[PDB]
């Protein structure tokens, strides 16, 4: 059937939309070619709609069914608990879109009488009505990018706040535990960046002659069929569930997950959806399961040997045993045709890779640098173009989420996050006298509140002390970073080094945690290095819950 149906009503904004980077004294010191930075707006909504609207084709075979049974078997070991209204409310972000029933996020987090009572009626409704399609709002997402040698806005579909709270009650535990139970080491969200690298590298080393490839599905959400979603539910149903949870999952599946009506910001019937909605709790878990299911089955059909999958939502990377150049290319092609039959056609044609550093997955790749002792150390990196464009936008405007903080945390070892993001933002936080102020950022979609001053401990725990001493980066990584700086008009190393030494001195003179930020975060900027010993507070950090599951679009806040 058609992934979408359109009435003709337009996808409308809910207020003025900013598309250009404001000329700002601070963002200008980070990146000079401000005209290359833009934010998508609903003005490109029509371009996106045309791309995600099409009739899906799906043909299932014995491999698909075999893998599904294997998956259901593992799901059978799980026991999901069901959250109380109180617990679900606590998971709601303070900035989550308000309900249309007289209350907002704050009321939800504060267990307000009106919010709680409405949520209860919505839950009871899920238990009683098993068919009425649940209403959803559709909006053009506002994201920042750098022009290319432009990207139309993505579309986000989400239900009301009341319904979102109910989703948590019925499925939060499910989506946080089942993927790992079912997919094991292949579930990407269980790994911190360091752990992901370790998994990728160890997997690559376990092969006689390794071959790997990333698979980009063309607009994955729209390729998800009604069948995929019911298959997905069938997996969840293998869990031991409370009666009410079981019914809520059944109702939520038929009333919301498989599709439903689309309403714009003005309250106008925009159309109908028959594919994956981006803004629901099950989106990450659902896409991961579906991608893993089709890919694992496709690998068998294609006869790829000893495959090892790493899946993060719709992002997939496969590493297998090479059977030779011609054969690998033929097997990959067979893989793609199998995936196409499963309704997961490729966007970018896949290509076999024999060099791990050249494989991009989750917009990132593994690369090598060296610590003070000279030992090779692997770490996760990526082209810094988008991260920098966003750092610049976030420096000029006030944004709910601070992608820059998230990028420093996740890419602490990289040459660009250290030289640029750390230097730029600490210099600004110092001046504005806001080093103590906790800021929100996202990690695998979930929102977190983090104080800049704890970055040293955070980085040591997550990446190890070598994150503060890496040097001699790969020629490929250096060329990529350099060409990026020239493109965006970003100051050269010498300028950043000078600014870093200055920021570093100001931090040291302050003592306390600030000085700790000076010593570790900026040791790369001075010649007379300082002995960097284990940070006490790093051995007392509970960062486990950071890498458990994916929640993009799930409206999840972890306090
Ligand atoms: C965090 C960081 C770590 C080490 C340094 S360094 O000055 O000690 N060494 C380098 C200096 C320049 C360079 O190549 C670049 C070219 C353009 C832009 C940035 C770096 C690469 C390296 C390195 O250690 O590999 C600078 C920044």
UniProtKB/Swiss-Prot annotation:
It is found in: Host cytoplasm; Host endoplasmic reticulum membrane. Binds 2 magnesium ion that constitute a dinuclear catalytic metal center. Its cofactor is Mg(2+). RNA-dependent RNA polymerase that performs primer-template recognition and RNA synthesis during viral replication. Initiates RNA transcription/replication at a flavin adenine dinucleotide (FAD), resulting in a 5'- FAD cap on viral RNAs. In this way, recognition of viral 5' RNA by host pattern recognition receptors can be bypassed, thereby evading activation of antiviral pathways. It comes from the Viruses. Mg(2+) 2 binds at residues 216, 314-315. The modification Phosphoserine is found at residues 29, 42. Activity is up-regulated by PRK2/PKN2-mediated phosphorylation. Residues 210-328 form the RdRp catalytic domain. It is a single-pass type IV membrane protein. The N-terminus is phosphorylated by host PRK2/PKN2. It catalyses: RNA(n) + a ribonucleoside 5'-triphosphate = RNA(n+1) + diphosphate. It comes from Hepatitis C virus genotype 1b (strain HC-J4). This is RNA-directed RNA polymerase. Homooligomer. Interacts with non-structural protein 5A. Interacts with host VAPB. Interacts with host PRK2/PKN2. Interacts with host HNRNPA1 and SEPT6; these interactions facilitate viral replication. Part of the replication complex composed of NS2, NS3, NS4A, NS4B, NS5A and the RNA-directed RNA polymerase.
């Amino acid at each position: 059937s058609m992934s979408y149906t359109w009435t003709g009503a337009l996808i409308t904004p809910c207020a003025a939309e900013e598309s250009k980077l404001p000329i700002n004294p601070l963002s200008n010191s980070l990146l000079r070619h401000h005209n290359m930075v833009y934010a998508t707006t609903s003005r490109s909504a029509s371009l996106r709609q045309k791309k995600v609207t099409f009739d899906r084709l799906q043909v299932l075979d014995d491999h698909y069914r075999d893998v599904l049974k294997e998956m259901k078997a593992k799901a059978s070991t799980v026991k999901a608990k069901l959250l109380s209204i109180e617990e679900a409310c606590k998971l709601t972000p303070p900035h989550s879109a308000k309900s249309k029933f007289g209350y907002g996020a704050k009321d939800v987090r504060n267990l307000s009488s009106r919010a709680v009572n409405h949520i209860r009626s919505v839950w009871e409704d899920l238990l009683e009505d098993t068919e009425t399609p649940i209403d959803t709002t559709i909006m053009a997402k506002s994201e920042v990018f750098c022009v290319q040698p432009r990207k139309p806005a993505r579309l986000i579909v989400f239900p009301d706040l009341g319904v979102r709270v109910c989703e948590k009650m019925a499925l939060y535990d499910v989506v946080s535990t089942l993927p790992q139970a079912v997919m094991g080491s292949s579930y990407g969200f269980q790994y911190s960046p360091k752990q992901r690298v370790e998994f990728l590298v160890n997997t690559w080393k376990s092969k006689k002659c390794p071959m790997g490839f990333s698979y980009d599905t063309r607009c994955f959400d729209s390729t998800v069929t009604e069948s995929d979603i019911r298959v997905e539910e069938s997996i969840y149903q293998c869990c031991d569930l409370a009666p009410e949870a079981r019914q809520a999952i059944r109702s939520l599946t038929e009333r919301l997950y498989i599709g439903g009506p689309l309403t714009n910001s003005k309250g106008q019937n925009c159309g109908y959806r028959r594919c994956r909605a981006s803004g629901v709790l099950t989106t990450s878990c659902g896409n991961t399961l579906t991608c893993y299911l089709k890919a694992t089955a496709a690998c068998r059909a294609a006869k790829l040997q000893d495959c090892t999958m790493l899946v993060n939502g719709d992002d997939l990377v496969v590493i297998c045993e090479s059977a030779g150049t011609q054969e690998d290319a033929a097997a990959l092609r067979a893989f793609t045709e199998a995936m196409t039959r499963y309704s997961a056609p490729p966007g970018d044609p896949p290509q076999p890779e024999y060099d791990l550093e050249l494989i991009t997955s989750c917009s990132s790749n593994v690369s090598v640098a060296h610590d003070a002792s000279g030992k090779r150390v692997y770490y996760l990196t990526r082209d810094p173009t988008t991260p920098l464009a966003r750092a610049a936008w976030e420096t000029a405007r006030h944004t709910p989420i601070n992608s820059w903080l998230g990028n420093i945390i996740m890419y602490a070892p990289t040459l660009w996050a250290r030289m640029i993001l750390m230097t730029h933002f600490f210099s600004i936080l110092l001046a504005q006298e806001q080093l103590e102020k906790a800021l929100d950022c996202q990690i695998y979609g979930a929102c977190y509140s983090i104080e800049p001053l704890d970055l040293p401990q955070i980085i040591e725990r997550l990446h190890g002390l070598s994150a503060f001493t890496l040097h001699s980066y790969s020629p490929g990584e250096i060329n990529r970073v350099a060409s990026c700086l020239r493109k965006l008009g970003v100051p050269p190393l010498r300028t950043w080094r000078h600014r870093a030494r200055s920021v570093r001195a100001k931090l040291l003179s302050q003592g306390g945690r600030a000085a700790t930020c000076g010593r570790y975060l900026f040791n790369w900027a001075v010649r007379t290095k300082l002995k960097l010993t284990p940070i006490p507070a790093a051995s007392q950090l509970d960062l486990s819950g950071w890498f458990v599951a994916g929640y993009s679009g799930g409206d999840i806040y972890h306090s």
